């Protein structure tokens, strides 16, 4: 039980960090094209899917 | 001044530009910006465009370059002379541009910046420029013709 | 020169001066003196006067401003022109002074430093200045008007 | 430029010479070299010669003073005036030399470095200089009169 | 003609010359000699000096350049102009010669070949050349400045 719980917590942490890292990296890659272009349409849907 | 040289060991290793309140410099160019006001800005990385960006001091915001995406075919101006825009590609005569010229801006006849020169292709009689520009929707895009090398 | 502007991010936000062999800079002005010889000395705090001081380098001790405690009523000058000294107050016409003019010394008709300006108050006709001066006994005193603002 | 001054506190306290494609600077002269590229190279110590040396930058390899070991009786020159060589000794007129002249090379009628000056002695008629020169075998040899003061 | 260009794909990669009765060309030069009488000769690989050599055909024996080991300091001629030789070093002004110029001979005031150029080093305002020369006893040797790039 000790080994099982420790393995689950380690798996959860590694998975949550990877998930958040991938999602945050997605936002940076999705939004960066528009930060370098202040005069852009920036559709509202962009702020809903990539944020 | 609109263009600021970047010095590594006392030699110029590139140029930094300020457009619409934001400063851009080549990500692959190492060294300090030869400007006390710009050297104090902490810039964010944008690996998609091989450049770093950030905001400029309130004193400079009033005189930054104007962004534009209207890029009809024809000739454009840049630091070393004129630039030809054809087939959605920026090209210049052979011998115009080289190592250390990365980050220079390309402007239209209205003084608006259309692309940032990061590199190019050395051909037999002409050269093709690897630049960062904007599409018809105004979204930043990087154009890197096959064989482009950073300058 | 004898007055050395103090620069923080490549912009002047005050002025340092050398009086009687000592380098005086305002305490509320943060930044580095635009120099290499005077900027390498450690400065002591004088928070009761909102000033900092240090020893002038041996090669610079001779090239310093002289000061006097005798301040007869009349007109004095500084970087921006004439300064009126009456009713125990230093004052300049409205709008002549402002933020950034901190640490600038005031000179008499003989070229002697009489006060170091740290701030001021805008009155109905003239702006009173908050300065560090010496009383009739030559003791350093902080002469500030009511509601003075640091510059 | 082939001879660069050395500065410690902003004033010149000696010289660093580019002779033979190598930097020659006295050891008793502390400070940075006027040229930023000569100051950026690591130098070796030769205590037996009271001088410090190192290889010059790529661009300075050709732009360097040539040296000669042949110093017949006659006159030579440096920035303080003419230098007279007699009885195998470098003697300058009374009062010509002094503090800060160390490291300056003595040039012949062809512009070649004959010796590097390090100090001197006032003999009451003429001043003898402490120099680093080359013997009849072309080997570096230090020649200093007894009691010579490092300059 | 006593010098023959070497071309691989129609571009000049180097030059060959007839000195003392032998045909000389560098190892790093690829392509064929335009003269079929020389190109058909089997050349020996003298990797010690980066030179290929062979025997001049009897029909070409008259097209032979005289050589000498007497190379005093001074100026020498070659296809790009004058060449300065001093301190056992061959030097040309920067920009005089480059890739493709290896194998050219250097001639004295009597038209005798004194060296064959293999490459060079750019030393500021001057470029040092890697050359194959004969010592004071006439023995073939290879002189290579550090960092020399084959031409």
UniProtKB/TrEMBL annotation, chains B, C, D, E:
<feature type="active site" description="Charge relay system">
    <location>
        <position position="28"/>
    </location>
</feature>
<comment type="function">
    <text>Provides the signal sequence for the translocation of the precursor of protein E3/E2 to the host endoplasmic reticulum. Furin-cleaved E3 remains associated with spike glycoprotein E1 and mediates pH protection of the latter during the transport via the secretory pathway. After virion release from the host cell, the assembly protein E3 is gradually released in the extracellular space.</text>
</comment>
<protein>
    <recommendedName>
        <fullName>Structural polyprotein</fullName>
    </recommendedName>
</protein>
<feature type="domain" description="Peptidase S3">
    <location>
        <begin position="2"/>
        <end position="151"/>
    </location>
</feature>
<feature type="active site" description="Charge relay system">
    <location>
        <position position="50"/>
    </location>
</feature>
<comment type="subunit">
    <text>The precursor of protein E3/E2 and E1 form a heterodimer shortly after synthesis.</text>
</comment>
<feature type="active site" description="Charge relay system">
    <location>
        <position position="102"/>
    </location>
</feature>
């Amino acid at each position: 039980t000790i080994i099982g719980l420790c393995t689950c917590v380690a798996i959860i942490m590694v998975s949550c960090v990877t998930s958040v890292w991938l999602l945050c990296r997605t936002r940076n890659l999705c939004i960066t094209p528009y930060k370098l272009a202040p005069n852009a349409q920036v559709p509202i849907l962009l702020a809903l899917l990539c944020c | 001044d609109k263009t600021f040289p970047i010095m590594l060991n006392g030699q110029v290793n590139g140029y930094a530009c300020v457009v619409g309140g934001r400063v851009f410099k080549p990500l692959h160019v190492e060294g300090r910006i030869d400007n006390e006001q710009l050297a104090a800005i902490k810039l964010k990385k944008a690996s998609i465009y091989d450049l770093e960006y950030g905001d400029v001091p309130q004193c400079m915001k009033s005189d930054t370059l104007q962004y534009t995406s209207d890029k009809p075919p024809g000739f454009y101006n840049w630091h070393h002379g004129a630039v030809q825009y054809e087939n959605n590609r920026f090209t210049v005569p052979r011998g115009v541009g080289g190592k250390g010229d990365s980050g220079r801006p390309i402007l239209d006849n209205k003084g608006r910046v259309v692309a940032i020169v990061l590199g190019g292709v050395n051909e037999g009689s002409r050269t093709a420029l690897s630049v960062v520009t904007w599409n018809q929707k105004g979204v930043t895009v990087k154009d890197t013709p096959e064989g482009s090398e950073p300058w």
